[model samples]
Target chain A: RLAVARELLLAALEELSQEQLKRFRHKLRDVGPDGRSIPWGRLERADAVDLAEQLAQFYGPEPALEVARKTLKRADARDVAAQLQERRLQR
Target chain B: RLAVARELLLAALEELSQEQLKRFRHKLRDVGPDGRSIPWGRLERADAVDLAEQLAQFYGPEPALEVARKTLKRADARDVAAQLQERRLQR
Candidate 1:
């Protein structure tokens, strides 16, 4: 649950474009000041990238790693085990 | 340089989708638990997963893995190593 919770989302959005991410950020920007509420919708690449980076930093590297791995798993259906191992070594 | 920076003039509203992502936390959420002014943005999937998860999870996984692979490549191009290997392995 907590493992793939956030980082995976970042990875998923990592594939978007900068302009797309920017639109996403603005679209999701808080509609209220409570900090718990936001507008949800398609995001620009920049918005998604910025959001992913921010969440990675906020959740810290460990959780961020978890999310990234989960994202790979979700996006691929092959033997990603070796790939994940390689990535771990690289990181 | 372009890796990351700040502009003091204008920044506001982004437009995207109704199911993209939502705001959950804050500027870095801690705004530098240290002493730096490095502000970070915290985000969540519209479902509250991390941003990456938000994007991946929303991918409507019923599509062929090949489509998923290409979509990612066409977007942010992250799965180069793994995907290339997969294609070679399949061949």
Candidate 2:
């Protein structure tokens, strides 16, 4: 989920660079559908950090890349499923 | 503005019929752009009432019909201008 990824990056930003923080906020802004504002403030920071930490532990350092890959995959799959389901229901 | 018109109707609805109130809320809901909620809470009741009272005074009896006509005219004009500008700007 991009929402989850956004939360994770925001959590990581508690200690990361200000530039990175700005990038994360921009990413969050980009999360919304057209004409809608993204609901990033609704995400759970703690859970996101936990996911990041788990991935970090699993990947044995440099887990950010893995986290990004996993998050993108999850988000893409969720979006595809949503589109397919919406089309099916409409039909 | 439709926002102003919404406020005027909502103000009237404080003493108007429940069905009328429902219509007012529906009107307000219709005020929003796609995927964006209208910021109706920003309107002032006093201003709305003043607008309704002015229209009522000007029309002198069966004020709702006059108000509706004027409202529709203004709304249509604004939308036409908006579409014109949007097309000119390729938006």
Candidate 3:
């Protein structure tokens, strides 16, 4: 199978701000069907790169792209998420 | 701040095996505060290329070498770790 793409997700994380990551983390808490959440302690002080690695530990590249879209959008980052959508399709 | 050198790390991950990575991961985890254990489920399954990218997000290129040493050695790949040491030093 073709390797799943994660560069887009990593790039988007690199672009987020402190507050943006904050809200993104919040949005992540409820995105799953169960009680899944990136532990509050794990993310409370994490930055963009840290989140990329941590997210990788749990989500594969493709699954992560979907999560990135939902979380960034719910966190009021529709523009960034849209870029992700646009870039993926253009690939 | 000078970017943490992750290139060496990525390079190592690219050439290394799963057991090497397992040891390397654990070794790096003890190097500092960000050393969260990567669940077995989180590793082995992913490709080295993908793991390289993920490690890059959270680590720098330089210091990663130091961490790679002791762990790689423990994993019976001291030669590999030494290669990184020489690679860094030869420059």
Candidate 4:
């Protein structure tokens, strides 16, 4: 399930422009641990999922949903849906 | 001398837009040694000089010159001017 979420998020990230990616990186930096930073170039599955959730509001639902749908073979739709729902609750 | 160049270059980098910075990172990746990537966030003096030269074309002479001038207390104008010249030769 986590793997599926990561894949979906990675796909969505690929569609982001360089400016968008940098903005996302800054967002991650703000929330990440002070001594430890999220390596944007080598993101782990959990990191990808976290970032995807954070980016949902700025990017809108289309990109994330499209990528999640594409990852149906490996990802559970319910899991992705839940992540999206969780993000909205935070707003 | 190198320290001066690095400081000037760092100031110039600060003026770049996120997209410009991302493009610069890609340029560095392409030229950097394989298996040993240039750390964009923690750039050494040599790396800054190298990147400054590479980015001079895209960013134009104005921003680089402005930063270089600002660094006159610590940086040598001759060094920064040479870097600008080197970049032109490559084009």
Q: Candidate 4 on B1-91: residue-level lDDT in tens?
A: 3335345555655554555444445444333235433345433333444556533322233344443334332333344445554543443
Candidate 1 residue-wise lDDT, A1-91, digit = tens? 5445454455555554555444435444333334222223223333555666654654465555554444344434224423454555443
TM-score, each model?
0.26, 0.20, 0.48, 0.25
Worst 10 residues of 4 chain A by lDDT: A72-81
DockQ of each: 0.15, 0.02, 0.04, 0.01
Residue A85 error, candidate 2, Å:
25
Give the Å shift of residue B23 in candidate 3: 14
Interface RMSD of each: 6.9, 15.6, 11.4, 20.4
Clashing pairs in 3: B4-B60, B4-B61, B5-B60, B5-B61, B5-B62, B6-B60, B6-B61
Local distance difference test scores for all models: 0.37, 0.37, 0.63, 0.42
- Candidate 2 per-residue lDDT, tens place, B8-75, comes to 33333233233333344335323323643334453233243443554444444343433443333344
Highest lDDT scorer = 3
Off by over 4 Å in 4: A1-26, A29-54, A57-91, B1-41, B48-64, B79-91
Error of 2 at A61 (Å): 28
Instruction: State which candidate has the highest DockQ.
Output: 1
Q: Candidate 1's residue-wise lDDT over B13-61, tens digit each?
A: 1121332112222212333325632224324222232432322333322
The alpha-carbon lDDT assigned to residue A81 of candidate 3 equals: 88
On DockQ, the stronger of 1 and 2 is: 1
